[PDB]
Design a protein around this ligand. Structure first.
Ligand SMILES: CNc1nc(Cl)nc2c1ncn2-c1cccc(C(=O)O)c1
Length: 164
């Protein structure tokens, strides 16, 4: 069912996360962590204190799809065991130093063709698939986008609700 999902998305904030490669999204799904550039890191740390749930919606560049979405469970932290991100051209490990812990809510894909009816008021009402890494998605758009994903019956949201 979708009822626990809707409870988790209640009054959530949503952010578009863009990844240059599939490898880091697979690593994020395996290890429950994410790292972003400092400008987005600051925005996510602020949002984490501000909302019952901060939702990251992932899209690998040029994939034509979203790869899933996750809830922040921590602010960023430094000093953990090195996350072996695959660094794109021009990107260094220091730029990706802050590490957020995340809990996956859906690890299934959604193709962009399925979200073409959703526009983001915070990005000039462009289709929600359009946006830079870190673009905030307004509540109603974000909620409907997350509800479009296929159910991920391997995840039990009971623990996530208790983190709230
Ligand atoms: C582990 N965290 C991350 N891993 C990867 Cl592979 N890419 C990330 C990222 N955080 C932001 N980006 C990003 C988004 C859009 C364009 C580019 C680019 O360099 O062209 C890079």
């Amino acid at each position: 069912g979708t009822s626990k999902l809707k409870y988790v998305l209640q009054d959530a904030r949503f952010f578009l996360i863009k990844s240059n490669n599939h490898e880091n999204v697979s690593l994020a799904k395996a290890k429950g962590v994410w790292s972003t550039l400092p400008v987005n890191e600051k925005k996510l740390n602020l949002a984490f204190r501000s909302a019952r749930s901060v939702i990251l919606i992932f899209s690998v560049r040029e994939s034509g799809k979203f790869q899933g979405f996750a809830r922040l469970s921590s602010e960023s932290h430094h000093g953990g065991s090195p996350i072996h991100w695959v660094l794109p051209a021009g990107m260094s490990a220091k730029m990706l130093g802050g590490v957020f812990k995340i809990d996956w809510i859906c690890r299934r894909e959604l193709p962009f063709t399925k979200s073409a009816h959703l526009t983001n008021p915070w990005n000039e009402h462009k289709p929600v698939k359009i946006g830079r890494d870190g673009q905030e998605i307004e509540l109603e758009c974000g909620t409907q986008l997350c509800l479009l994903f296929p159910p991920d019956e391997s995840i039990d949201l009971y623990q996530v609700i208790h983190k709230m």
